[PDB]
Amino acid sequence: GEMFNVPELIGAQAHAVNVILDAETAYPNLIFSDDLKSVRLGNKWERLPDGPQRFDSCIIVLGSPSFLSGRHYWEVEVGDKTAWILGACKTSISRKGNMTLSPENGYWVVIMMKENEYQASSVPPTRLLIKEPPKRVGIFVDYRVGSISFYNVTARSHIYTFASCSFSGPLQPIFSPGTRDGGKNTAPLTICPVG
Known part of the structure; x- marks a missing residue:
């Protein structure tokens, strides 16, 4: 069964890990809290210093730590936002250009489009x-x-599992706060401790 190892929310939360945002990877209009738990999208003139490690097209930032084994859980406040991306990726993803955010390309993500x-x-x-x-x-x-699972913490329910994944090399968390959506989507994502 695809889900035999996949826990319910409480069982997943037992594997909570401390995740922080790696601001050096970020798309350069992203803005970070001092504690590296929150990220939001600034205006076009609000720019982090460019570098080869930064995403240049996709509004993305990676988290730390990476991992090569084991079970790992983290939770993110999305609130009343209208768009975002959450999940994990290979540490070796390309940062420059546009690429589809697919398992074959090293991404396992859920997206709120609107x-x-x-x-x-x-x-x-x-x-x-x-x-x-x-x-x-x-x-x-x-x-x-070889699974990554997503939970609706508010509803205390499973959303989705990618099973039979092709994990090689380290994985790490990935995040996007989405575009500003005319002002409807300016709030940050905030990584939170399990309640």
């Missing part, structure tokens, strides 16, 4: 039939079994 539109970034994408919009999302990686 109100009431959520997808798993399979190819083709899979619509997620969410009825209670999450205000906090949990991400659980089980390296050995």
Whole structure:
């Protein structure tokens, strides 16, 4: 079974790890809290110093630590935002250009596109039939079994699992606060301790 190893929310939360944002990877208009738990999208003139490590096209930032084995869980406040990206990726993803955010390309993510539109970034994408919009999302990686699972912490329910994943090399958390959406989506993502 695809889900035999996949825990419920409480079981996932037992594997909580401390994640921080790696601001040096960030798309240069992203803005970070001093504690490296929050990220939001600034204006075009608000720029971090450029470098080869930064994403240049996709509004993305990576987290730390990376991991090569084991079970790892973290939780993110998404609140009343209208768009975001959450999940994990290979540490070796390319930073420059546009690339599809797919398992084959080293990404395992769920995307909020707009109100009431959520997808798993399979190819083709899979619509997620969410009825209670999450205000906090949990991400659980089980390296050995090759799964990454997403939870609606608000509803205390599973959202989606990528199973039979092709994990090689280290993985790390990935985040996007989305575009500003005319002012509807300016709030940060905030990594949070399990409640």
